[PDB]
Design a protein around this nucleic acid. Structure first.
Ligand SMILES: [Mg+2]
Ligand SMILES: [Mg+2]
Ligand SMILES: [Mg+2]
Ligand SMILES: [Mg+2]
Ligand SMILES: [Mg+2]
Ligand SMILES: [Mg+2]
Ligand SMILES: [Mg+2]
Ligand SMILES: [Mg+2]
Ligand SMILES: [Mg+2]
Ligand SMILES: [Mg+2]
Lengths: 48, 140, 103, 56, 117, 110
RNA sequence: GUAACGGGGCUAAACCAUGCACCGAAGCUGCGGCAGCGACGCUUAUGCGUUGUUGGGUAGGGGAGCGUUCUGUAAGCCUG
RNA sequence: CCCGGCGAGGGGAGUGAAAAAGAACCUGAAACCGUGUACGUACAAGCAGUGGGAGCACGCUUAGGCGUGUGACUGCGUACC
């Protein structure tokens, strides 16, 4: 059989497709885009 | 691509002898200034050098405005404080009439290097056809 | 026999030369293909004959050719003025070659 | 008192524009191996015109 | 579980030190000043180029009012006649080009010059 | 690497030695040895020495004579200086840099 | 320190009135490109061909993604 | 083996797959400091770039106001947090 130059052949069993709605989010921590810090001008919260 | 405006280094040296030996002052300055930058523009562009040599004869003669002959100062202020601050009127311009006109024609320049080494293309001269040696050879 | 042709924003100074333009999406291919063209470009140069801006020449004023008419340039640039930050971006630009025959 | 902001390198070099050098390679010898400055030969083996107290 | 941001980090500003396009000293030598080295450059740029039109139109316009003055004219008059003139639509940028051929363009002045019906 | 004579260190900073080598580069060699031997200032440390080596090498394991060699190029790089500390008035204390540099001279000319 | 027109300079390059002409913005038009909303033909989970509209944005919300370390698919695959 | 003060340090010679592994010794970034070349720069003013753009050097691109370096003069323009 010719080797390589297939493109592939077949995909692994396991392949857990598209839920993503199932997950997604994951949420990026606040602390990214240039100016973050966010919150009030008092950062009301740490105080609970 | 497309294409520029062509004003490489140019070359239009001149000899225009703008006499202005009479009543043509003030507004008259604009032409000496504009003809310095290149108004008709055979190829020129506000940005390239070459003042297009001009020669204002006499100069020591101008009707001036309607009364700025006895009423207008120039104001220079030297530098050495002592609040000297020099002031001279126009009718008071008897030691060097050549100065004026050249003074007026100035400021109306791009202001900076280009327009700075562009002023000399005037040649003061206060006494009609005299020492035309500034370019005695060719003229217009 | 010198440039005159328009399109895009008008720009014709080339005779046997080529000049890139918009896209000519209507059809470009590799070889040229039914390229319209008009003296009607307000081009008063032409050959010796003056040819006032838009004289005559109804149906067959002149024509042109067609180069590669491909490639997608670069001038990405960036931008988040003091106003906090946002943006960055990058932008290319598709163009068309085209050369030009029989002015 | 202090510098209000850092002097550029174009500044430090532009400040050292007086490194100065000598060695006029002027008259060294008039009778030895090329030695002697522009005035006295090699002491204890130098002399102006002739052997001064000691030479070779 | 691991980070040691380092190969990533260096790469990160290297992109900006790469586009340091030989500025002046710390400007292209540092890292923190390299960033702000973009305000007049990158920041102004995206918008600065589109702002250029003036520099050229002020030029062509100049060229035009310059040449047309052969008969004295008035740049205001020129385009005016050439407007109510024939199908004259494309009379712009050809200014500097007109400089490349008075004989060809001085003629355009004639058509426009015929302002009077 | 025709000869290559480096000293490394010397204990005399860099900018100090640099001044003694500048007006003493290309060509010469016969002059350089003269230039150096008559210019009073410790800067001439291992400079007159490295040239001695830079010429000795080019002699022992090379052709060349006295009429040859021009000292193609010279330069000095900064090196691992010692870091000591000085008392100073009050409780204060300031760091003193010992400074050092690598001579290095090449006479690959002929 | 001219310094109460930005400067020059202007007796009209000032003021009133009328008219027309041009210049003039990232506004508008034109050409190409992108993304969200509806339309209309193709054409179907559909995606597309044209198309009317919208796309400054701090606090803040929402939605998509890039890259890193570590685990499985890995005694696989790349590698002197 | 050689210069050197039986120094330091170094040049050769040798071992090594390598000494672009020499003991400061795996890989050796940045800041900062030089030597060489190219272009610019000693009647020019300010966040130092961006927009136009002459010239010079390279490749000349193996034909075209082309790619890289540099940028006289010129419109703009007071860093980030
Ligand atoms: Mg921050
Ligand atoms: Mg508050
Ligand atoms: Mg805060
Ligand atoms: Mg100005
Ligand atoms: Mg506009
Ligand atoms: Mg928005
Ligand atoms: Mg927000
Ligand atoms: Mg190592
Ligand atoms: Mg100069
Ligand atoms: Mg440019």
């Amino acid at each position: 059989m010719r080797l390589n130059t297939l493109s592939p052949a077949e995909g692994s069993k396991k392949a857990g497709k598209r839920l993503g709605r199932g997950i997604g989010s994951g949420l990026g921590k606040t602390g990214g885009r240039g100016h973050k810090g966010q919150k009030s001008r008092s950062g009301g919260g740490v105080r609970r | 691509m497309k294409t520029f405006t062509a004003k490489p280094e140019t070359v239009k040296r001149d000899w225009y002898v703008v006499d202005a030996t009479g009543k043509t002052l003030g507004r008259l300055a604009t032409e000496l200034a504009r003809r310095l930058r290149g108004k008709h523009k055979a190829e020129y562009t506000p940005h390239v050098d070459t003042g297009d040599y001009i020669i204002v004869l006499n100069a020591d003669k101008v009707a001036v405005t309607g009364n700025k002959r006895t009423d207008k100062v120039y104001y220079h202020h030297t530098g050495h404080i002592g609040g000297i601050k020099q002031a001279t009127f126009e009718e008071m311009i008897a030691r060097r009439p050549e100065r004026v006109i050249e003074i007026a024609v100035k400021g109306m320049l791009p202001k900076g290097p280009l327009g700075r080494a562009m002023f000399r293309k005037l040649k003061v001269y206060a006494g009609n056809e005299h020492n035309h040696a500034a370019q005695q050879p060719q003229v217009l | 026999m010198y440039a005159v042709f328009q399109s895009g924003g008008k720009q014709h100074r080339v005779s046997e030369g080529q000049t890139v333009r918009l896209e000519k999406l209507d059809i470009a291919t590799g070889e040229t293909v039914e390229f319209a063209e008009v003296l009607m470009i307000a081009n008063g140069e032409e050959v010796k004959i003056g040819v006032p801006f838009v004289d005559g020449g109804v149906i067959k004023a002149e024509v042109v050719a067609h180069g590669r008419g491909e490639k997608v340039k670069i001038v990405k640039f960036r931008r988040r003025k003091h106003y906090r930050k946002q943006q960055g971006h990058r932008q290319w630009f598709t163009d068309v070659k085209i050369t030009g025959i029989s002015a | 008192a202090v510098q209000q902001n850092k002097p550029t390198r174009s500044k430090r070099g532009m400040r050292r524009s007086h490194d100065a050098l000598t060695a006029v390679t002027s008259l060294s010898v008039d009778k030895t191996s090329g030695e002697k400055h522009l005035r006295h030969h090699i002491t204890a083996d130098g002399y102006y015109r002739g052997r001064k107290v000691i030479a070779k | 579980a691991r980070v040691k941001r380092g190969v990533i980090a260096r790469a990160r500003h290297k992109k900006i030190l790469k586009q340091a396009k030989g500025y002046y000293g710390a400007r292209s030598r540092v890292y923190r000043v390299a960033f702000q080295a973009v305000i007049k450059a990158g920041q102004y740029a995206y918008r600065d180029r589109r702002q250029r039109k003036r520099q050229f139109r002020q030029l062509w316009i100049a060229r035009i009012n310059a040449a047309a003055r052969q008969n004295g004219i008035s740049y205001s008059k020129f385009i005016n006649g050439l407007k109510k003139a024939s199908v004259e639509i494309d009379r712009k940028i050809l200014a500097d080009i007109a400089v490349f051929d008075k004989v060809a363009f001085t003629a355009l002045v004639e058509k426009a010059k015929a302002a009077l019906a | 690497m025709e000869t290559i004579a480096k000293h490394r260190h010397a204990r005399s900073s860099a900018q100090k030695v640099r001044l003694v080598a500048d007006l003493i580069r290309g060509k010469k060699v016969s002059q350089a040895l003269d230039i150096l031997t008559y210019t009073n200032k410790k800067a001439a440390v291992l400079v007159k020495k490295v040239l001695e080596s830079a010429i000795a090498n080019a002699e022992h394991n090379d052709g060349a004579d006295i009429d040859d060699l021009k000292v193609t190029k010279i330069f000095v790089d900064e090196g691992p200086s010692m870091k000591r500390i000085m008392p100073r008035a009050k409780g204060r204390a300031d760091r003193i840099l010992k400074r050092t540099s690598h001579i290095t001279v090449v006479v690959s000319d002929r």
